[PDB]
């Protein structure tokens, strides 16, 4: 069949929800952020945000309101999932242990029912007596709290008003009272009901139906001393209570619809409002009194605070700081100053959080490393639109370059004990040593009295008692700082050469062949302590002390020639504590003792590129938890360094690497430099917190980026991106975009803001000809807002806008390709369009335009109109495949530089999505599922091979291989259809089978073949076959890869095992979660393995790992019926994490 594996490559970045309260403790203020399936909690401290805990849920978080019941120490959190899983959650801390425990849980499903159009609404009454749920039309669901029911059992009431806009529980009432807007033939209205869980029924609400504007869309319960409801529409702003009634219609609000609100002051004096254009408003409630005190409310005031990203939710925090949850752009921490700026904004940005969503179009490019690129780009939207470039690993920014070939080793040096910065960088060469001083950008060359320049240095640096140290092949030399001469010199009693060296501030250990010497550094003397000879040649040494300073190391790490072993010896006795055999015939070239995240490790690198790492116990010197990774093919040099007061490890090789810790686990991140041979940390005033790197021809100095798995560079476009294509031969990208301009009414159209298209270096406008819809053009000023589409050419390095071609009025850009055609050696950009008019629902007209870009300028070469929407197009064997309405057309590129139809297929309702492999063609239809086409070379014609007879509304399509087809679907589900490979009857060959089904919980907009994973460096043969990425509305990026049936069964069983112990966070079953689920049907998952689940196997405890194993049956690839251990399962999941 088909067997697929899905893992998250990038967690969702869009902020779906915004609620304030504390929850973590009574004393701290907490911020909770829902990112689809991910819930993030922070505490606001001082101009900052602190992560305390991040959890996943087996559900799309739909409701996030946390309530505090009488006699409870802190808020609890109610979350309702899109599959309607409800739960009440509590924050539990136990020393260093943090666990989110489930107090109450339940689904509250209605077996039969139509989910409402304005979606799920969750509310909690002010006395925390119940949860209100608007799930379906005509029904109001009520969850009684009163502690237990522990299962959150519920009942339905009949709501006579069948269409509900918004509901809130009122404050200051005797009985729980709801206030909601509904629409009927009589317009829309504000109503109140008392909720009597007593009797399970409704009672007459305290308020008279009032009459309100038709687009009043949001209800706000104003707290006491005031109570009542505020109702926000598009035109007006009203306050509602029993006899009091207030209405306002501010003109500033008309320009854009208010979409969210947040309470600033607990007394309900002030509110924050956000609209679809990202405008931030302040709503103030003016207090007044009559006798001794009151609630009057006076009147209503609205103020503009400034501009933010378009907000999905708002929460005020403290000291003028507001968090802005955005779905369409970057989320923000924003400051509201009392001084408005030149534009009149009170808003100033403090921090931005990267959001890749919505991810609309994307591509995989190899440009950065030329061998294999692993670059992933995506798109933002509206004023928030952007391109995002996403990269695995760590890059370096060079600030200086000096060519010294044959440089052997690097050490930083502090000649002045007084400024504490390195003013010196010491370099080594074969049989000689050079000193380089650092004054700002300047280096050159210098002498250092006490350091020799005619022996090769193996180590040098700062040592104890205001001294410098240099260890050569001839001797180890101690050197004073202030007065500058040789204070002490150690040589082997027979003058043999030093072979290996290790040194810290107060200790020196050097090897001589098999001999080992431990020296201590004292004032003016190097004192030789006891000494021994080892069984074989010493390969490598390290005496980095782990602990506090200390600065005396009790341990000594060592590698041998003969037995290729890593052993830990004690100082000064050199007593063996652990001999670890590394295996093979390749000697260890580097060994290092380190501390990551308070945990200790031993790293040991061979000349192979292989790297062993072990848990190290500093008290016993025991090496545990052997693990092996591969880091290139050359031998790897390991060097410790500091960044952001954290400890990291740089690895020099044909694939240079940084080793570091996150979530108490070792991670290996790539360095995009071609090659690194030697490396030392550098901190000069000319180069702060820098790195000195060296290869076999040049020596470089510069800084290094933040330590993280993925690098994201943002290139703001200030308009909506739609599609993107890379063009090798032009060294640039093509981008479809559109900007909004408003009717000035007398002259033309003007832009809201500057953008890529109004700021291009060069520009071009469509001049036709015609259609002709001109000459009585039949177009209007109605609906004053207009989209204007452009093709942008963005340079691949600077990401600057090289060229912007604006398309015709009312022309709509749908498709973009980069390719060459026919016998033409020229590379073209090809764009498919549609004409979009307000008074015509589906396009009757469209275009396919062929552009050539050469040196700034794009001439349109092809220019051919066809009748319909050009939904999709793709390069097809030197031909152009295109979707136009219900038609799939194949174009040939003729010698006359024009597009000539060769082939036609007509059997579609609407062909939105096209994908091709070899001669096969996948057409995705809007309502008519999936289509497998074939081009027939001998007929020059199309043949309809097979189709999927299951109705699906597709969002995206991909071919995994000639038999297997990946589909993304409206209900956040993936499915796979295959060609019946067994021929038999026509029936089965015209049938694609859905052999895979899987609920993603995300809406996929784009599929593409590729990997950000390098080559191997294995392994290989490879774990999985193929690599397909996808981008989603929430900004999530995922990966799909193929598995053999044996592996699929291995990981499937592990899941069922993993599923008994997690825990589930609200106790949602992984089963059902991943189950295909639409309005129509439901079903368990098949053909898909949840990579996120399997990967979380590493995050479980050791004993739990063993409990998961049990009777699980391993195969190592040859004749294994055998049982498995804790370590065998770990290695696989470790393998599975490296594929993304």
């Amino acid at each position: 069949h088909s067997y697929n594996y899905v893992v998250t490559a990038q967690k969702p970045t869009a902020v779906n929800g915004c609620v304030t309260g504390h929850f973590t403790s009574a004393e701290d203020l907490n911020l909770l952020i829902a990112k689809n399936t991910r819930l993030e909690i922070y505490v606001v401290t001082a101009e900052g945000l602190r992560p305390v805990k991040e959890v996943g849920m087996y559900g799309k978080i739909a409701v996030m309101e946390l309530f505090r019941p009488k006699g409870e120490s802190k808020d609890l959190l109610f979350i309702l999932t899109a599959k309607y899983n409800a739960c009440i959650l509590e924050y539990k801390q136990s020393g260093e242990s943090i666990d989110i425990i489930t107090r109450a849980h339940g689904n509250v499903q209605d077996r039969i029912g139509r989910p409402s159009e304005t979606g799920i609404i969750g509310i909690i009454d002010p006395e925390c007596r119940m949860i209100g749920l608007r799930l379906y039309d005509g029904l109001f669901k009520v969850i009684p709290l009163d502690r237990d029911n522990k299962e959150l059992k519920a009942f339905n009431i009949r709501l006579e008003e069948l269409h509900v806009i918004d509901v809130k529980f009122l404050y200051g009432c005797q009985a729980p009272t709801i206030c909601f807007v509904y629409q009927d033939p009589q317009g829309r209205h504000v109503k109140t009901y008392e909720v009597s869980l007593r009797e399970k029924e409704f009672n007459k609400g305290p308020w008279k139906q009032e009459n309100v504007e038709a687009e009043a869309s949001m209800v706000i319960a104003v707290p006491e001393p005031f109570g009542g409801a505020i109702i926000i529409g598009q035109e007006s702003i009203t306050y509602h209570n029993g006899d009091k009634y207030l209405a306002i219609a501010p003109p500033i609000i008309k320009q854009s619809t208010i979409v969210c609100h947040n309470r600033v002051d607990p007394n309900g004096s002030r509110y924050l409002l956000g609209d679809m254009e990202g405008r931030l408003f302040m709503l103030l409630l003016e207090k007044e009194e009559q006798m001794d005190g009151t609630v009057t409310l006076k009147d209503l005031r609205v103020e503009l605070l400034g501009e933010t990203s378009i907000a999905e939710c708002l929460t005020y925090l403290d000291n003028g700081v507001v968090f802005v949850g955005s779905r369409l752009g970057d989320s923000q921490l924003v400051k509201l100053n009392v001084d408005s700026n030149e534009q009149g904004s009170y808003v100033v940005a403090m921090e931005t959080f990267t959001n890749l969503g919505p991810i609309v179009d994307m591509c995989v490019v190899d440009l950065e490393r030329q061998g294999q690129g692993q670059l992933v780009t995506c798109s933002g939207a509206f004023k928030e639109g952007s391109l995002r470039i996403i990269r695995n690993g760590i890059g370096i920014h060079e600030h200086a370059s000096i060519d010294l070939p044959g440089i052997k080793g690097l050490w930083p040096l502090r000649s002045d004990p007084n400024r504490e910065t390195d003013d010196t960088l010491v370099l080594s060469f074969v049989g000689q040593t050079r000193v380089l001083m650092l004054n700002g950008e300047e280096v050159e060359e210098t002498e250092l009295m006490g350091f020799v320049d005619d022996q090769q240095t193996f180590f040098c640096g700062n040592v104890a008692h205001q001294q410098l140290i240099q260890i050569t092949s001839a001797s180890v030399r101690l050197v004073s700082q202030e007065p500058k001469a040789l204070v002490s010199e150690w040589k082997e009693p027979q003058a043999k050469n030093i072979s290996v060296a290790s040194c810290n501030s107060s200790q020196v250990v050097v090897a001589v062949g098999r001999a080992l010497y431990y020296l201590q550094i004292h004032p003016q003397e190097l004192r030789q302590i006891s000494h021994t000879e080892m069984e074989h040649e010493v390969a490598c040494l390290d005496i980095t002390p782990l602990g506090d300073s200390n600065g005396l190391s009790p341990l000594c790490a060592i590698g041998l020639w003969t037995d290729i072993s890593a052993r830990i010896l004690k100082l000064p006795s050199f007593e063996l504590l652990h001999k670890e055999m590394l295996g093979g015939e390749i000697i260890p070239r580097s060994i290092l003792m380190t501390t990551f995240e308070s945990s200790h490790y031993l790293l040991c690198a061979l000349g192979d590129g292989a790297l062993f790492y072990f848990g190290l116990n500093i008290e016993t010197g025991l090496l545990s938890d052997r693990k092996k990774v591969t880091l290139g093919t050359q031998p790897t040099v390991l060097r410790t360094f500091r960044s952001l007061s954290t400890t990291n490890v740089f690895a020099c090789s044909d694939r240079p690497t940084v080793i570091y810790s996150s979530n108490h686990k070792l991670v290996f991140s790539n360095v995009n430099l071609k090659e690194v041979n030697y490396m030392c940390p550098l901190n000069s005033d000319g180069y702060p917190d820098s790195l000195a790197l060296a290869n076999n021809s040049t020596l470089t100095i510069g800084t290094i980026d933040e330590i993280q798995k993925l690098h994201i560079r943002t290139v703001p476009l200030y308009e909506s991106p739609r599609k993107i294509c890379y063009q090798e031969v032009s060294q640039c990208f093509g981008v479809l975009s559109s900007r909004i301009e408003v009717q000035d009414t007398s002259g033309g159209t003007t832009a809201l803001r500057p953008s890529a298209s109004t700021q291009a270096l060069s520009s071009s406008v469509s001049s036709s000809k015609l259609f002709s819809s001109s000459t009585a053009p039949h177009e209007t000023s109605f609906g004053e807002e207009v989209e204007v589409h452009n093709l942008l050419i963005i340079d691949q390095h600077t990401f600057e806008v090289l060229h912007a071609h604006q398309f015709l009025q009312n022309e709509y850009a749908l498709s973009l390709v980069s390719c060459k055609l026919g016998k033409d050696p020229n590379t073209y950009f090809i764009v498919g369009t549609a004409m979009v008019y307000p008074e015509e629902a589906e396009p009757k007209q469209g275009r396919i335009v062929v552009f050539q870009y050469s040196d700034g300028k794009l001439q349109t070469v092809a220019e051919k109109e066809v009748k319909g929407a050009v939904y999709s197009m793709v390069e097809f064997n030197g031909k152009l495949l295109a979707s136009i309405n219900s038609t799939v057309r194949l174009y040939e590129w003729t010698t006359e530089k024009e597009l000539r139809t060769e082939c036609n297929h007509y059997n579609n309702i609407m062909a939105l999505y096209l994908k091709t492999k070899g001669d096969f063609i996948l057409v995705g239809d809007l309502m008519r599922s999936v289509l497998l086409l074939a081009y027939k070379p001998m007929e020059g014609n199309f043949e309809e091979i097979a189709r999927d007879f299951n109705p699906n509304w597709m969002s995206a399509v991909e071919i995994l291989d000639d038999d297997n087809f990946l589909g993304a679907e409206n209900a956040f589900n993936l499915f796979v259809c295959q060609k019946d490979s067994a021929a038999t009857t026509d029936e089965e060959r015209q049938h694609l089978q859905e052999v895979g089904l899987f609920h993603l919980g995300e809406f996929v907009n784009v599929f593409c073949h590729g990997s950000l994973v390098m080559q191997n460096l294995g392994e290989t043969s490879t774990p999985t076959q193929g690599s397909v990425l996808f981008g989603t509305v929430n900004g999530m990026i995922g990966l799909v890869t193929s598995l053999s049936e044996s592996w699929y069964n291995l990981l499937l069983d592990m899941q069922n095992r993993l599923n008994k112990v997690i825990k589930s966070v609200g106790k949602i079953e992984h089963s059902f979660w991943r189950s295909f689920h639409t309005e129509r049907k439901t079903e368990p998952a098949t053909g898909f393995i949840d990579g996120d689940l399997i990967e979380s196997f590493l995050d479980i405890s050791r004993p739990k790992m063993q409990e998961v194993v049990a009777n699980l049956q391993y195969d190592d690839g040859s004749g294994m019926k055998r049982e498995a251990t804790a370590d065998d399962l770990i290695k696989v999941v470790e393998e599975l994490t490296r594929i993304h």
Binding site: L139, G187, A841, M927, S929, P951, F1003
Partner: protein, 402 residues
Amino acid sequence: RNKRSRSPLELEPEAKKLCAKGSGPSRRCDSDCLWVGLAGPQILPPCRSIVRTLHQHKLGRASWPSVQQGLQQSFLHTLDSYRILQKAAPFDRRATSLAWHPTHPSTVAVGSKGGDIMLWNFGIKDKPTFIKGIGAGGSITGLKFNPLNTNQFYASSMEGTTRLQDFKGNILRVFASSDTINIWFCSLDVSASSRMVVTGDNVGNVILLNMDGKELWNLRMHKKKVTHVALNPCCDWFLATASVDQTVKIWDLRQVRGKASFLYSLPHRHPVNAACFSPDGARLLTTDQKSEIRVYSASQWDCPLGLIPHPHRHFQHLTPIKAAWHPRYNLIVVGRYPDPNFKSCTPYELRTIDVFDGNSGKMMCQLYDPESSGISSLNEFNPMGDTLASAMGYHILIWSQQ
């Protein structure tokens, strides 16, 4: 009304509509305005055309209610152009039962007054596989494909049997029986997942059997012959059926015991031939013997969301007109049977297949052909939803598109 604005938005983006009817402009409006009817031109301008909505979906800016709705006006388009009739084949007698293949889009199987079944395909020709009945008392009043193996069909008969037989027509086994007759089953249904079969009688009892043997059923439901039984797709355990009793009788297949102890029963001014839950399972569309169409919610199964007045009726040799759901979008197709005594807004009413919105009840379309002037009774869209099969004029009709 509210309806006018509601259709024209067709919502997200809202920025059209929202006007409270413009305060009546300024009335109904008073004197000359719109009018209602003229709500039509604006429907023409207000729309923010599709491929504009598709993009908003992918931005998460618009809800599925938007796109799905707006897709159904791209269905209503191509519907008006459905006017072509792709194929027609007869057998004999009149068309009675219709079964759309659950999977295969070109495969439809229809029943007869005479116990004849035709299996029919497109792009094919290759004349259909046939089975001939005795032709007098052989009336098969309902037909359901066997979900398990598509070569078999569950078919209810006037012969005194509800059976499963291979399309080669050699019967496998019989479930419900007579041993007497002067009575027969009429209604039938199967739910794939449930593996329940349920069948009706003219006397008013049902008999429900598990796909194999072993009934617990047959307690008389109501007094008169039962025209249809509907097993809800989204619910296994429960049911709804149709009788001349002028009652719907929504049921629970399991915990119903007491001999007509039921949950909700829905009264009608007349007898009812159709039950027909929606693929949601969350609505019940009922077709009544003279004029009416009932839509019922799952929120208060008692009060129907609303009625669409339609000209159907009973005639003896007319096969009872049954309204049916679109499997995908929200739409109703009932065959229209014009009478002098209707309220009709369009005499003289050429006799056509009619399409209604649902959730509104207005007519979004009508299907007519000359050279088949035939009155439409059975109209059931294909599970894909791109094709409509009508067994009416003594023949079968597939429309599809040019």
